[PDB]
Design a protein around this nucleic acid. Structure first.
Ligand SMILES: [K+]
Ligand SMILES: [Mg+2]
Ligand SMILES: [Mg+2]
Ligand SMILES: [Mg+2]
Ligand SMILES: [Mg+2]
Ligand SMILES: [Mg+2]
Ligand SMILES: [Mg+2]
Ligand SMILES: [Mg+2]
Ligand SMILES: [Mg+2]
Ligand SMILES: [Mg+2]
Ligand code: NA
Ligand code: NA
Length: 86
RNA sequence: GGGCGGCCUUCGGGCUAGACGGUGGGAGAGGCUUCGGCUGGUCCACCCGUGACGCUC
């Protein structure tokens, strides 16, 4: 579920400025937030499988944004890859 | 890795129409499950955010 007391909390942390909600960093962060939030899920329910499909999709998406931000803005890439760790 | 890709530009750099994110909706014979839930995807809107971040073996 996550909720604002989570999804907004992350954004308010990775935002590049007071209203940022879609800046690659924010996009990656909250992307890494539900990736875990579901890695954990899959454990309790090892028979789900179907949900793993997205685990894979989310993971790919996260790596494609990161690669993008690694070309256009190296500095910011190391920054972001921290507070989360790649 | 490969192949093919938006607009403008005096090539320095701009920009949003794509994609993604935020928010708010919808449809559903998804899946797992102490049956109490946990969860994947999917389609819309806006005229919010990033700014081609894409599509393809
Ligand atoms: K499915
Ligand atoms: Mg696809
Ligand atoms: Mg440029
Ligand atoms: Mg999506
Ligand atoms: Mg709803
Ligand atoms: Mg049900
Ligand atoms: Mg759900
Ligand atoms: Mg917009
Ligand atoms: Mg730029
Ligand atoms: Mg291009
Ligand atoms: Na223009
Ligand atoms: Na193409």
């Amino acid at each position: 579920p996550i909720t604002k007391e989570e999804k907004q909390k992350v954004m308010q942390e990775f935002a590049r400025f007071p209203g940022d909600t879609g800046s690659t960093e924010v996009q990656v962060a909250l992307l890494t937030l539900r990736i875990n939030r579901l890695s954990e899920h899959l454990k309790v329910h090892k028979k789900d499988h179907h949900s793993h499909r997205g685990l894979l999709m989310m993971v790919g998406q996260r790596r494609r944004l990161l690669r993008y931000l690694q070309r256009e803005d190296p500095e910011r890439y190391r920054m972001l890859i921290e507070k989360l760790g790649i």
